[PDB]
């Protein structure tokens, strides 16, 4: 009753961590609770901020992750002691190698039983920390605002990675007195910094005497927010660019400067690179030989000063923020004459390269022949996606050609396997998508291992009334099928499943697809049905992508 | 074709390991595919080893250490490297906990690529370090046999716990020649110790002396195999024995001598307390009041000797091997006539608090009222439970009153969350005992939260053809119910879930039970089909277990 | 003034760890003091506790773990947060490298300014792990006696090993009412554990079976105090034995059985090994050719199960505590009358080499030439051990060459470069075993490399009192000499230096010696001089150890 008295003075750790956490920011909290959680979900509630209880820690601590990166801001992962963080491990190790920030909130053991053999007793900031640009415990609820400031800054701020905070119970639960808990300040936006002068005009001197020159575009860029920065580049340059998969969209993929779909060539002749937000890593075969010209000459565009340089040199470093940069090399366009030519022989060859790629494509595309290909799969899939989607691929075959056949029109709108080639990220990718996104289709298309990895978080999407569309295509293997069995193969798993029964389970619509006249007809249904859905698709146990030259590892 | 040479003289790594594997004993290899493991697995099947290919690496490496358990002998896990090693690290946390032994083969990106950001490149050995008892990386395909037998003998000698090798790509396909790979020798049998002969009598000394005794059987006996003993010892004795959760078994839970009915009383009352291969952590709070006596006179049989005088000093101290000792005891029982005597005022407060909780427990067991309650639905349960059943349980309060109403006959059938309190062992355990026990049946009765960590792991199962039962005990959220919402509460899932509709996805038998009259036949039904099935209890949102005087953590 | 009142009732984390420290039994602590630990040393000599303040925690640190050796029981090790710390980790390393015992206690900054950049603070406990057996920081005083019993038990029982005790400031200052201290029991005597009768018998079966039998004797057996029954064995037996380099002294080095002199051979040859605390790592050439029979036989004393078959399979297994396994042993021999028989070929063969190897080293020995050869100065040198002395000894040729010209006759009166082949250990060894045993001689016989590493701590023992005698074989440089506008060579030093100076800044005797005529009476001044001293030897440049068929690294 508000009629009797009651003492006000005090707060408990709890509940400064959810105004900690909405002070700076924090809008999503992704987990599961247990002791000793349980009051910091209901306090982040309390504080409004969004509580998605999912139903691993797994797929928790990828949605966090995503989140961060729709949003700009790390976002929080709740999960219990012991194996709860263990758990959420997944996530830290994802969010390190991709350069996306997270908080990881991992609540302890109390620290008065520490040495006991306590419930939950573990070593947690010790784990976390390799995988993890901060890890701190929290041992005074007084230092709350203080600890969760500076784990946000350093999750947000340099090159991004994930942050960890552990919760014993007995600072979550420990109270202290209103008046005397000391405040923190707001964590602005990340700094940005530029490039000296004589570098940004070295740059464009570099640009302007390259025969074959290829700009890359990185998801350093998307996060960054540099897409109308890098629009304006490529248009004033009219230079051929490449996407890497995360930073497809960047620039809209029809944009007709794309090199997307003669990649191999684009790498392979090119005498100048410039990397925008983007790493000579195995994703960009590092830079060299088979891969490039042994000569290649580098611009390189990244935040990280120790990136510079690796495996192959720079010419041309550019070391600060993408969004700054392309900047300060737009505003030293204003003042030259020069742009790359509407016709040159590299313009020929990649188009010529285009235009063999899709005539080598054409036949799959048009092929009604069921069990389907990837092609003609994706085929009707891609005449589903609104302009406006949030595209979640996953898996090898499905996620691969997906990639090509899935084009995105605005950046940080294609969530996938990424920098560490990660199964299970799939449905915690797409939760986060519709958390963040509530307003915008959220559309994730797996292969039939990978679904298996995270598909109870159809059960989260269901009770959250996030109307995901899962569509599986399910060749009843990773990779490829397998003949009926003799033990079954490694790679086998069930090309028969009716894995769509699963959104039954969860109020859901499925639909099951072994014909291609069957295809449209559920992808249309599945896209008009007012909440989540499956769309369980078989496919041929052979059916591949496009012959290449090279194998995409080597 | 066999009518051409071939050349016969070389064999590489993948190879190598696989028979090294089976050298060692190892015939059971839980895992998920891909770069750069698939020749493991494969040479593991050529080998005869059986693999199992399941849904994600979380619920692989809970099933490898649920294997070694059961076969004593270590069992493997196989992953990919990068996330494949750290989703597994949830297996190798909860091996260091319980003191069971696994070993992880986690693949790794080719060591000439290191420095470069090849695919999936991670510090496996040191992320896997802080969980493991041994970790290594295989650097040349010549040392496989070695290190195999130093990992396999590593886990399973002293106190067990989780190997883990690492397997770089360029040494899974290295080749060397057959006639050059040093042999390893097979790795025997633990090496058992016995007590020094002043122990052993100052033990029985101690127990003559003491006006009320207890005897706590914990899963330290289980794994020594000290089953026949420990029968013996208490047979002898006459002594008043409880059993741990994973010590059920070890003694017929239905034996006379039992205290499990009176727990609390026991454990309060005791003057002196004889761990057998038990711990005073968390699961025996810890040997101090309030749950003890602050005067608790121990003796302790443990294989660790650091672990002796843990939190309560231990009058007498056993080091060593749980059979070996109690072997030494029964030996040294023959030569004195000592038992405890058939009336004691120990024995009638015993007998009567076990008869006060039983009263306590019966209206609930004997209420048909729909929703059910745990204790009326357990009543179907237990009553339908063959005695050689491999029992798998797992959630919050579906897992704690199912320890009570499901006994145990035969030591090593009962599989739960163990040590670290773990949600996520329930399918993999599962899988693991359908494995290593096909004759027997296998049951798992699993909250609803607990069935969403691992369920897609029903698939694996019916692909083995493994006929697991499950139950899944379904009260619409973490440990209690919740009423419609404003958002949803963070503890709160879906009651109204179908998830036998999953059992349908993969060829099982699905069964929805709402009402009392309903369970006998479900059970029934599921029980008798040829194959997987999961029978979905939608129970009563506020059942919960008997009051008791403390919480059970406290 | 005693007249006015003052209030006893608290007491501080300082006094309450010098409390835990003396209730254990740790009677020496070594360290430099510093911000923040000054209280505790202080704390600690009011309880009785005797502080050795030192030049650098690094031979503090040694010091700490020799001391544990020399009494049985952990020792402590005292150093200042950050630097402190990491500088005694150098400490941390040897002592898991010997299975030796040591408490490392280091200070932390205040657990109020964690996360600031507060002076020293450094995340200690994971920077130590690695290192340790037992690492944990003291997080509130009152858990002080809990946290302190644990790492002395951990440190002592079971195989031994460092532990470290995090002491942050507002612990080390805080205080607590001493009422309300939970106190904890005494950490008593290791405990003993005993093999199978079954393989006792095999053992002795085995031994009766060989041609060319070796027992062993290694530091593990000095650790478990077994020096009486292994004499007993040997004497009983009459089996050859060769002793390790720290396991001289358990049995007298002058034993007509032993096989020392001819140590290339024994192992060669011998077709059955008896390792008694001894391991197959590199000290023994790992059981292996090109040192060993490819089929050796292996009966193997080990306390650690794991340890059993490491390189080469163990036939039989004694897997327990060194004492009571031989008196096993022991007992079992009085119902047999088997003995190695008194003439064999095997003894001839042990015999012959022993001659053989006399003969090539007596000219050296005998040789008076200055500058004088190892052999000849150890000759003045082994004349004036006294039989009680403690032998340290420290460097390359310096240390081997003394290894087997200085005999031993006691066990733990020998302490050297050890495990991890360290330099720096010598001094600090030297003023532990002058701390522990004052009534003994400490004479380290030290390279002039090896002597850098630590010689600062001269100042140490003349500060205490501690008559060390410090003789160093100064041939110029690290192993051997070397000529004086070229660079200096890499391992060159000061063949001129006067180290023996040294002595001189502190109060102490310094002799130098070039000539055979003058180093009898200069050790004879020095092992007279009532106090500590340097004899500084300048030896031949390029002498050398006797040759040998194989390299002792290889
Ligand atoms: C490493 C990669 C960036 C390498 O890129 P590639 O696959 O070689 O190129 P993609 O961009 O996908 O294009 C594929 C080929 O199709 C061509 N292409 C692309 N778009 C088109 C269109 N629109 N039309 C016609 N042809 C096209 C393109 O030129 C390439 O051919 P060519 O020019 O002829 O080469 C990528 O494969 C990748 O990110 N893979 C993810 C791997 C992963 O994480 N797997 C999960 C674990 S698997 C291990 O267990
Ligand atoms: C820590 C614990 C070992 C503590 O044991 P308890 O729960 O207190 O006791 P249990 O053996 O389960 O018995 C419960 C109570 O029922 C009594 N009891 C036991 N058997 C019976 C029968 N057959 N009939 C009637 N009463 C019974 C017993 O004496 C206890 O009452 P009293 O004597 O009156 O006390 C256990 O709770 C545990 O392992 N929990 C796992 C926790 C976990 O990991 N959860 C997932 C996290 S949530
Ligand atoms: C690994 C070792 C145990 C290997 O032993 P060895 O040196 O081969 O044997 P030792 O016992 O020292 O004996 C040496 C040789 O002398 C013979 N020998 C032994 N005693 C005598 C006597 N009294 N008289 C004559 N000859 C003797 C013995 O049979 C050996 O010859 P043969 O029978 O003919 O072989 C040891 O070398 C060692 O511990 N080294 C430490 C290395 C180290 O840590 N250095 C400091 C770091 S170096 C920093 O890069
Ligand atoms: C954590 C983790 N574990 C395993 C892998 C290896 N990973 C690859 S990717 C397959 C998907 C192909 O199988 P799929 O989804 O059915 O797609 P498709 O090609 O058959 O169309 C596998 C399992 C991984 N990268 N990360
Ligand atoms: C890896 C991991 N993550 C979370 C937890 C917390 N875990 C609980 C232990 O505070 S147990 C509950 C299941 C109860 O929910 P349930 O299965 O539906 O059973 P029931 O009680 O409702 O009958 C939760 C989720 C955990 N231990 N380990
Ligand atoms: C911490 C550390 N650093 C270096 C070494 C290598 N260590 C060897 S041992 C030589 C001493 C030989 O030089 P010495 O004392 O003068 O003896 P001597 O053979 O010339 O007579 C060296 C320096 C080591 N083992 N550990
Ligand atoms: N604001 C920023 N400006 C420029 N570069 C950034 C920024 N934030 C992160 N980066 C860099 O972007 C790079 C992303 O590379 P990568 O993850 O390999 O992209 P992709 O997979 O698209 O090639 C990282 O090297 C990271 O340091
Ligand atoms: N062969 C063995 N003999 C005796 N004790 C053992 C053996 N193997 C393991 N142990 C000990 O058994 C104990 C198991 O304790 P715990 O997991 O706490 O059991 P519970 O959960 O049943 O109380 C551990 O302390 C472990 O060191
Ligand atoms: N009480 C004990 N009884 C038997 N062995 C022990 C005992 N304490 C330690 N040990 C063992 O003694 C061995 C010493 O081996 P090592 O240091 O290689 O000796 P050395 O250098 O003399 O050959 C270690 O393997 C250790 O486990
Ligand atoms: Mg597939
Ligand atoms: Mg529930
Ligand atoms: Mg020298």
Same mark, same amino acid.
């Given at each position: 009753?508000?009629?009797?008295?009651?003492?006000?003075?005090?707060?408990?750790?709890?509940?400064?961590?959810?105004?900690?956490?909405?002070?700076?920011?924090?809008?999503?909290?992704?987990?599961?609770?247990?002791?000793?959680?349980?009051?910091?979900?209901?306090?982040?509630?309390?504080?409004?901020?969004?509580?998605?209880?999912?139903?691993?820690?797994?797929?928790?601590?990828?949605?966090?992750?995503?989140?961060?990166?729709?949003?700009?801001?790390?976002?929080?992962?709740?999960?219990?002691?012991?194996?709860?963080?263990?758990?959420?491990?997944?996530?830290?190790?994802?969010?390190?190698?991709?350069?996306?920030?997270?908080?990881?909130?991992?609540?302890?053991?109390?620290?008065?039983?520490?040495?006991?053999?306590?419930?939950?007793?573990?070593?947690? !900031?010790?784990?976390?920390?390799?995988?993890?640009?901060?890890?701190?415990?929290?041992?005074?609820?007084?230092?709350?605002?203080?600890?969760?400031?500076?784990?946000?800054?350093?999750?947000?701020?340099?090159?991004?990675?994930?942050?960890?905070?552990?919760?014993?119970?007995?600072?979550?639960?420990?109270?202290?007195?209103?008046?005397? !808990?000391?405040?923190?300040?707001?964590?602005?936006?990340?700094?940005?910094?530029?490039?000296?002068?004589?570098?940004?005009?070295?740059?464009?001197?570099?640009?302007?005497?390259?025969?074959?020159?290829?700009?890359?575009?990185?998801?350093?860029?998307?996060?960054?927010?540099?897409?109308?920065?890098?629009?304006?580049?490529?248009?004033?340059?009219?230079?051929?660019?490449?996407?890497?998969?995360?930073?497809?969209?960047?620039?809209?993929?029809?944009?007709?400067?794309?090199?997307?779909?003669?990649?191999?060539?684009?790498?392979?002749?090119?005498?100048?690179?410039?990397?925008?937000?983007?790493?000579?890593?195995?994703?960009?075969?590092?830079?060299?030989?088979?891969?490039?010209?042994?000569?290649?000459?580098?611009?390189?565009?990244?935040?990280?000063?120790?990136?510079?340089?690796?495996?192959?040199?720079?010419?041309?470093?550019?070391?600060?923020?993408?969004?700054?940069?392309?900047?300060?090399?737009?505003?030293?366009?204003?003042?030259?004459?020069?742009?790359?030519?509407?016709?040159?022989?590299?313009?020929?060859?990649?188009?010529?390269?285009?235009?063999?790629?899709?005539?080598?494509?054409?036949?799959?595309?048009?092929?009604?022949?069921?069990?389907?290909?990837?092609?003609?799969?994706?085929?009707?899939?891609?005449?589903?996606?609104?302009?406006?989607?949030?595209?979640?691929?996953?898996?090898?075959?499905?996620?691969?050609?997906?990639?090509?056949?899935?084009?995105?029109?605005?950046?940080?709108?294609?969530?996938?396997?990424?920098?560490?080639?990660?199964?299970?990220?799939?449905?915690?990718?797409?939760?986060?998508?519709?958390? !963040?996104?509530?307003?915008?289709?959220?559309?994730?298309?797996?292969?039939?291992?990978?679904?298996?990895?995270?598909?109870?978080?159809?059960?989260?999407?269901?009770?959250?009334?996030?109307?995901?569309?899962?569509?599986?295509?399910?060749?009843?293997?990773?990779?490829?099928?397998?003949?009926?069995?003799?033990?079954?193969?490694?790679?086998?798993?069930?090309?028969?499943?009716?894995?769509?029964?699963?959104?039954?389970?969860?109020?859901?619509?499925?639909?099951?697809?072994?014909?291609?006249?069957?295809?449209?007809?559920?992808?249309?249904?599945?896209?008009?049905?007012?909440?989540?859905?499956?769309?369980?698709?078989?496919?041929?146990?052979?059916?591949?992508?496009?012959?290449?030259?090279?194998?995409?590892?080597?």
């Amino acid at each position: 009753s508000n009629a009797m008295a009651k003492s006000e003075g005090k707060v408990n750790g709890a509940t400064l961590m959810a105004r900690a956490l909405q002070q700076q920011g924090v809008q999503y909290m992704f987990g599961i609770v247990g002791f000793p959680v349980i009051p910091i979900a209901i306090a982040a509630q309390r504080e409004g901020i969004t509580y998605i209880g999912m139903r691993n820690e797994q797929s928790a601590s990828y949605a966090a992750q995503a989140a961060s990166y729709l949003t700009g801001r790390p976002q929080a992962c709740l999960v219990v002691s012991g194996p709860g963080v263990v758990h959420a491990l997944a996530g830290l190790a994802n969010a390190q190698v991709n350069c996306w920030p997270m908080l990881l909130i991992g609540g302890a053991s109390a620290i008065e039983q520490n040495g006991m053999g306590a419930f939950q007793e573990e070593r947690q !900031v010790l784990l976390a920390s390799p995988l993890c640009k901060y890890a701190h415990q929290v041992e005074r609820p007084e230092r709350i605002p203080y600890y969760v400031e500076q784990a946000v800054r350093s999750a947000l701020f340099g090159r991004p990675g994930a942050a960890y905070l552990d919760m014993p119970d007995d600072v979550i639960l420990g109270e202290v007195e209103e008046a005397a !808990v000391r405040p923190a300040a707001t964590v602005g936006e990340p700094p940005r910094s530029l490039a000296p002068q004589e570098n940004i005009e070295a740059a464009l001197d570099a640009l302007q005497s390259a025969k074959r020159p290829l700009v890359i575009v990185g998801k350093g860029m998307a996060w960054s927010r540099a897409e109308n920065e890098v629009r304006q580049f490529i248009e004033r340059t009219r230079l051929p660019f490449l996407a890497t998969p995360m930073g497809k969209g960047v620039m809209p993929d029809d944009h007709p400067l794309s090199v997307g779909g003669a990649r191999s060539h684009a790498l392979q002749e090119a005498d100048l690179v410039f990397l925008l937000g983007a790493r000579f890593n195995w994703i960009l075969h590092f830079g060299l030989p088979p891969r490039y010209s042994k000569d290649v000459r580098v611009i390189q565009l990244d935040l990280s000063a120790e990136e510079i340089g690796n495996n192959r040199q720079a010419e041309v470093a550019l070391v600060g923020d993408g969004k700054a940069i392309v900047g300060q090399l737009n505003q030293a366009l204003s003042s030259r004459q020069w742009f790359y030519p509407a016709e040159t022989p590299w313009r020929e060859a990649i188009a010529a390269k285009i235009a063999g790629n899709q005539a080598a494509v054409a036949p799959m595309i048009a092929d009604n022949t069921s069990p389907m290909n990837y092609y003609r799969v994706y085929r009707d899939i891609a005449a589903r996606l609104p302009r406006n989607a949030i595209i979640v691929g996953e898996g090898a075959n499905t996620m691969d050609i997906g990639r090509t056949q899935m084009p995105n029109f605005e950046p940080r709108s294609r969530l996938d396997a990424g920098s560490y080639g990660t199964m299970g990220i799939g449905l915690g990718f797409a939760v986060a998508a519709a958390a !963040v996104h509530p307003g915008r289709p959220v559309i994730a298309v797996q292969g039939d291992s990978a679904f298996g990895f995270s598909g109870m978080e159809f059960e989260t999407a269901a009770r959250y009334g996030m109307p995901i569309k899962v569509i599986i295509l399910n060749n009843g293997g990773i990779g490829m099928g397998s003949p009926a069995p003799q033990p079954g193969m490694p790679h086998a798993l069930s090309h028969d499943a009716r894995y769509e029964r699963i959104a039954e389970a969860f109020g859901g619509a499925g639909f099951y697809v072994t014909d291609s006249a069957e295809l449209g007809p559920a992808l249309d249904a599945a896209m008009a049905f007012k909440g989540p859905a499956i769309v369980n698709i078989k496919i041929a146990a052979t059916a591949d992508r496009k012959p290449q030259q090279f194998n995409w590892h080597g």
